[PDB]
Amino acid sequence: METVQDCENKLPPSLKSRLCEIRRYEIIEGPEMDKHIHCVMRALDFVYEDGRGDYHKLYDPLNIIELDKRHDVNLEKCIGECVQVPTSERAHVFYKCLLKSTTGRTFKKVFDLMELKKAGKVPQHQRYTAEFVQIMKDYDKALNC
Ligand SMILES: NCCc1c[nH]c2ccc(O)cc12
């Protein structure tokens, strides 16, 4: 039960400085970022221990928000990619691949929702509403973003 907060508190100071880029889903390369994104993808329960994207953790959640045959396709593609990289880089390649796909748009909603559900900031059945968007913005503002 390590949280996304636990992971950010742990960042090394070259990245702590760039927290707001990170939390904007902006892509930063490196083995620093490789380890942090493994930490967060595990905290949000999106990847296996070795960093492989879990299809079944994302498929239904993505489709509930945006019903789209493309989630299947993008999940299969991005899981395929992450398997072919080393385990240090795997979760981060999965994450990066998804954000670049047409699934990115909905992935960020699912990611935001899970982050705040796990933080106990919104109820477990919370949907992606205008209120939620404001809750996320205020949450980031408290972190200086
Ligand atoms: N609310 C999304 C925050 C967020 C998006 N991508 C991230 C990557 C790492 C992290 O600690 C946080 C994030």
Swiss-Prot record:
One of its GO terms (biological process) is sensory perception of smell. Changing D112L: Reduces serotonin binding and eliminates tryptamine binding. It holds the Pfam family PBP_GOBP. Female saliva (at protein level). Female salivary gland. Not detected in female carcass without salivary glands. Not detected in male tissues. Keywords: Disulfide bond, Secreted, Signal, Vasoactive, Vasodilator. It comes from the Eukaryota. This is Short form salivary protein D7R4. It comes from Anopheles gambiae (African malaria mosquito). The gene is D7r4.
